[PDB]
Structure formats: structure tokens, C-alpha cells
Design a protein around this ligand. Structure first.
Ligand SMILES: Nc1nc2c(ncn2[C@@H]2O[C@H](COP(=O)(O)OP(=O)(O)O)[C@@H](O)[C@H]2O)c(=O)[nH]1
Ligand SMILES: [Mg+2]
Length: 314
């Protein structure tokens, strides 16, 4: 089984994919149309679904069209010791394909994390965010498995180019983490970090946040940490901080040119998902208020107007 499989879905998904082209065969893209297919995508895997050809937008409309086709997509995905799934919560295709695929990985009893974007353009985007987050929490519950995600809100003002750019970087860091070439760091360890419910049975499988941090201080400030996993380049600087239920260390190799940071900390928690939802729901609400506070003029035809079948008023 390959070391890591990288799944992207939808527009955002493939846009983030173009920056990870150098990983070639490890990258698998999926969309409902080719709207976002560029040239650097031939260096990687690409699959589009039938019947759909890129419309919504609408997840309710896309789901039943793509559901039957999932078995087939799964076949285009080899066994892996870890997976990364990436897509937007805001659109219609990524926010369907992604969770559908996520559900299959969970039946592979696989070890995986997800990178998702909070789209913030419209009450469509916002509404979709909520539904997809809700979807992910239902899968967690039904499959009894934490659904671990790095959440990136499209902060007002900031360019998608920029937002995509940091997601790419965070993905590399996870690719490093699971590149199996560390000291003390087992493949079984990594599974136990991200699938903490398998051994910690008193804990509740739910949607969790993944925090990636390059300082000990930054990691400690992650609230109500559940499951930590640290990489050190200088083993001496190793410190056990915070209060996670699960903690595991590995050591990095200096001759590894992947290593671009003195120390990386991968911290899963869940308490912060509440606020994410509060923000998103409050945004939708404030927009929705102005939407239904808008008023239009009365018509400029009335019942004295002779109107034919084509709408002609002569
Ligand atoms: N960060 C980021 N956000 C994007 C990008 N493209 C689109 N968006 C935002 O994400 C939402 C969904 O877009 P898209 O990924 O094309 O949806 P999908 O293909 O139907 O799954 C849009 O409404 C925008 O809010 C991107 O490349 N990066
Ligand atoms: Mg699209």
C-alpha cells in the first residue's frame, strides 16, 4: 500500500491540487465537470462524474446523481496507510464528493485528515458550509470515528490564491508527518493519534479540528487538546506540554530536505467547532436579514391593462 493518498474534490479542491502537482501519482482529483482542469493536472490523476457536467451550486441536486458512482471512484484509489481529503464546504460538488468519499475511507477503517474551506460569498456558501459540517458530524457519529479536519475560513479581504497557498503548505507538513521516515514514529502510532476513539472508548466520535503549529507556545494554546503528535528536529528541545489524552513524539532527520521547520505539532481538538458554527450561522443570519428586509416596487401593470398570451400590451 502506498504511503499516502491525496484526494481533492471540486473547484477549490483542484485549485489546491495544482500546487501539489510534484506529488504526482499520489494526487487524485474528482469533480462533476472540468471547469477547473488545467495542464498541470496530467501529472496527476483526474476523474469526472457522468450525468452532472458542473452545474450547482446545489448539493441536494448533485447527491443523487453522484451517489451511485462512488464505488467506481473508490476503485481509482489504492490502499493507503494515510489519506488527505481536500475540498470546499461551500460549493455543490466538493461538498458532496468529499464527504461521500470520506465515508468510504471510514469503512476502509482508514487513517485520514481533511482540509476544508469555509466559503463566505453568499447565504448559499454559508448555508452549504453548515450542511457539510453537519454531514461530517453525522458520518463521525454513524461510523464511530473522529472526523478530523483543518478548517480554513475564506477571511474577508483575503485572496483565494493566498488562502489556497497556505493550505498547500499545511498539506506538505502532513505528508512529511506520515512519510514513515521518522524515529520512534510507527504507522500504528499515527493511526492511534487520528483514530483516538478506537482505544479511548469513553470519548465521543465527532467532527474535530486539526491544528498545525510550529511553536510549543502555539500548540499549548490549543484549548482542550485531545490528541497530540509532535515532530522534533532537535530531540533535546523535546518537552511534554499541555493536557492531551493522547501524546506521541517522533524525531526528524536533518538530511531530510522535506524538513523546513525545527518542530511541528499536530493537535486535534473539538471544543472549537462550536465557535466555527456560531460565526458561520451568524453570518448567514445577518445576510439573510438584509435579504428579507429588501423591498421592491409595486407592479406597473394592473388589472385595467389588456395583456395578451405573449405579454403584449397594445
Ligand atoms: N479558498 C478558496 N476558495 C474558493 C476557491 N474557489 C472557490 N472558492 C470559494 O468556494 C466556494 C465553492 O467553490 P467550488 O470549489 O468551485 O465548489 P464545487 O466545485 O462545486 O465543489 C465558492 O463559492 C467560493 O466561495 C479556491 O480556489 N480557494
Ligand atoms: Mg466547480
Amino acid at each position: 500500500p502506498v504511503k499516502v493518498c491525496l484526494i481533492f474534490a471540486g473547484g477549490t479542491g483542484m485549485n489546491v491540487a495544482t500546487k501539489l502537482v510534484d506529488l504526482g501519482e499520489a494526487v487524485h482529483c474528482f469533480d462533476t465537470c472540468d471547469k477547473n482542469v488545467v495542464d498541470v493536472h496530467r501529472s496527476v490523476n483526474v476523474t469526472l462524474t457522468k450525468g452532472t457536467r458542473g452545474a450547482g451550486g446545489n448539493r441536494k441536486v448533485i447527491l443523487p446523481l453522484v451517489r451511485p458512482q462512488i464505488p467506481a471512484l473508490m476503485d481509482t484509489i489504492p490502499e493507503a496507510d494515510f489519506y488527505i481529503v481536500c475540498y470546499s464546504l461551500g460549493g455543490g460538488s466538493g461538498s458532496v464528493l468529499g464527504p461521500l468519499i470520506t465515508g468510504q475511507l471510514a469503512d476502509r477503517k482508514a487513517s485520514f485528515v481533511s482540509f476544508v474551506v469555509g466559503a463566505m460569498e453568499s447565504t448559499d456558501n454559508l448555508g452549504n458550509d453548515i450542511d457539510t459540517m453537519k454531514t461530517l458530524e453525522a458520518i463521525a457519529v454513524n461510523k464511530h470515528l473522529p472526523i478530523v479536519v483543518n478548517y480554513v475560513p475564506n477571511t474577508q479581504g483575503r485572496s483565494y490564491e493566498s488562502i489556497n497557498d497556505e493550505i498547500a503548505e499545511k498539506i506538505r507538513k502532513v505528508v512529511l508527518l506520515v512519510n514513515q521516515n521518522h524515529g520512534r514514529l510507527d504507522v500504528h502510532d499515527v493511526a492511534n493519534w487520528v483514530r483516538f476513539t478506537d482505544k479511548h472508548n469513553y470519548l465521543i466520535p465527532q467532527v474535530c479540528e486539526l491544528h498545525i503549529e510550529t511553536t510549543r507556545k502555539d500548540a499549548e494554546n490549543v484549548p482542550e487538546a485531545i490528541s497530540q503528535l509532535s515532530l522534533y528536529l532537535d530531540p533535546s528541545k523535546e518537552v511534554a506540554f499541555g493536557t492531551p489524552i493522547y501524546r506521541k513524539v517522533g524525531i526528524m532527520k536533518v538530511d531530510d530536505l522535506d524538513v523546513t521547520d525545527d518542530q511541528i505539532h499536530f493537535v486535534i481538538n473539538s471544543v472549537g467547532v462550536v465557535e466555527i458554527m456560531k460565526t458561520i450561522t451568524d453570518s448567514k443570519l445577518e445576510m439573510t436579514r438584509q435579504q428579507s428586509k429588501f423591498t421592491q416596487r409595486n407592479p406597473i401593470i394592473d388589472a385595467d391593462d389588456n395583456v395578451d398570451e405573449d405579454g403584449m400590451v397594445v
